[PDB]
A = this chain, B = another copy of it.
């Protein structure tokens, strides 16, 4: 492959999705989450030179964050909070970039992964009412 797949974390209780394109790398990503359930519910992604917004999950959270990524801007730090198991969920995401930008979405009360780093090219996982999530990098 021309890609590196981060471990997808939390569970199998959703519906599979893969957002990647030759169109290029991620230019913006949004996380929607709730104080009520302390979960990620909904993610949206836009790629370089492509105005289609690829969404998954139910946008029912009372909070969202957007990170915008310059074309030459990499992820140098990355943490996903989650509930472990087969009935697992993604609870939170923390990203830090080569340009000193960072975002913090949701909660981090149980399990954590510190992922591979590099140029963010896509996301894979499963979502229904809630977000499983794995990041995808270049080389």
Binding site for B on A (CB under 8 A): 6-7, 9, 28, 32, 62-68, 70, 76-77, 84, 99-103, 110-118
Contacts and interface: CB of A to CB of B under 8 A. Distances in A.
Given A7-B28, A28-B7, A66 B114 contact: yes
Nearest to A66: B113
A92 to B, nearest CB: 13
Contacts of A103: 112, 114
Contacts of A64: 84, 111
B70 A116 contact: yes
A112 to B, nearest CB: 5
B66 A110 contact: no
Contact of A99 (B28, B68, B76, B99): B76
6 contacts: A7-B66, A62-B110, A66-B113, A67-B114, A103-B112, A103-B114
Contacts of A68: 6-7, 113-116
Contacts of A32: 84
Contacts of A6: 68
Contacts of A102: 114
A68 B9 CA distance: 12
B65 A110 contact: no
